From a paper:
Glutathione transferases (GSTs) constitute a widespread superfamily of enzymes notably involved in xenobiotic detoxification and/or in specialized metabolism. PtGSTU19 and 20, two paralogs sharing more than 91% sequence identity (95% of sequence similarity), would have diverged from a common ancestor of [name] and P. yatungensis species. These enzymes display the distinctive glutathione (GSH)-conjugation and peroxidase activities against model substrates. PtGSTU19 and [name] have the same secondary structures as the known GSTU structures and show the canonical cytosolic GST fold.
The crystal structures of PtGSTU19 and 20 were solved in their apo form (U19 APO and [name] APO ) and in complex with GSH (U19 GSH and [name] GSH ). In PtGSTU20APO, no signal was found in the electronic density map corresponding to the region between β2 and β3, which includes helix α2 and its upstream and downstream loops (residues Glu34 to Lys51). In contrast, this region is well defined in the final electron density map of PtGSTU20GSH and PtGSTU20GSPAP and adopts the same conformation as observed in known GSTU structures including PtGSTU19APO/GSH. This region contains the invariant Lys39 that stabilizes the C-terminal carboxylate group of glutathione. PtGSTU20 has a valine residue at the beginning of the β2 to β3 region and not a glutamic acid as the other known GSTU crystal structures. Indeed, this latter residue participates in the stabilization of the region between β2 and β3 even in the absence of glutathione (see earlier). When a significant structural change is observed, α2 helix most often undergoes the most prominent rearrangement, as in the case of PtGSTU20. In PtGSTU19 and 20, glutathione binding induces two distinct stabilizations, β2 to β3 region for PtGSTU20 and α6 helix for PtGSTU19. In U20APO/GSH/GS-PAP, this tryptophan residue is buried (accessible surface area (ASA) of 4 Å2), making the H-site quite deep. A cysteine residue replaces Tyr160 in PtGSTU20 (Cys160) and only the first conformation is present whatever the form (U20APO/GSH/GSP).
Author numbering:
A (entry chain A), B (entry chain A): 3 to 33, 52 to 217
Write the structure that this text describes.
Amino acid sequence: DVKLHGSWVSPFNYRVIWALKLKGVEFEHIVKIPVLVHGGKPIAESLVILEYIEETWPENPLLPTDPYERAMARFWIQYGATKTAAFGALFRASGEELEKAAKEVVEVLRVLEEQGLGDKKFFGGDSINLVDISFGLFTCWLEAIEEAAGVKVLEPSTLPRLHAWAQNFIEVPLIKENIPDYDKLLLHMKGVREKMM
Amino acid sequence: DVKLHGSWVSPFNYRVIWALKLKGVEFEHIVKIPVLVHGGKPIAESLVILEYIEETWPENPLLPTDPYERAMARFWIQYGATKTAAFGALFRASGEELEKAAKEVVEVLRVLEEQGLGDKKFFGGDSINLVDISFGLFTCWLEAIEEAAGVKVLEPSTLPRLHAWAQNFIEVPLIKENIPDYDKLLLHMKGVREKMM
Ligand SMILES: [Ca+2]
Ligand SMILES: [Ca+2]
């Protein structure tokens, strides 16, 4: 009834895995992607798939009920999706350019921390929502890119609240039981950086 | 109660003008933008503002009720928002490069025509929806960019159905009464092309 055409490394595919397990939806994971196929009908683009999952299985909501709060959630999701030019530079740049790219990524994450997260445990408050799911790539995927490139970005000293969020997110049992193996993910990131020089 | 911080040329600001007039919402237009301010609270990004307007004033819906149909509408909106690298080239490129950029824009519009519009009068069926509004920049703004650059993109011969859609959209009384003056818009596009060489 529900098929997920994805991969074992893509953070975009894992956003869908999380949202489906948060709704209790059974699916067959078939390893561009991701493409969710529900009753033979396909939905592409992880952000479009997430809103489809939220509307199709409304129990245990992953977006707030208030329209202003929903607009703020979509604003932060769009903000993360737009700021990908800074993250690409972590796979291409080397030396002094790489340290400038890492500082740019930190400034992007700082806006998210100050204006999006604030003092909440999660972007969704006391539990994860679609905003947390959309920023989940900043946990073990960003950690792997940092190690493969030799640069530090998400540190407790420079981003105290976002660093504490990233630990809390990765420790959520649903997330902990559904993430790539770090060793395999790091080797994948090293290979991607090698390809893009 | 509702303020719109915008401009007289931005197609992104006009998407908001249309959606507000389709809902019968009175507002003060104050001429980055657009920023809708509702009860002192600001919402930025035209696509985030459109979903906020649709949720806040649910009468005369601008999105379908079915989740699969809503996902398809959001997919096409995201598709138009992503394919902006082809449209930028119409302001920068010259000669043989400009004709190659115009053909790339045509291929982007052809996918939209075949898979998004099909045989419907509008992307929303018998009346305009948020998909039509999001593609409204392909009407008089694209016409102005074509004239300022000396290239043809949306022609009846190469895009028969999308060309007929663009005429139908621009003739909708709500749109006809709420678009920039073509002379002023063309002079703005000529100036933007001059700036970007
Ligand atoms: Ca870290
Ligand atoms: Ca034309």
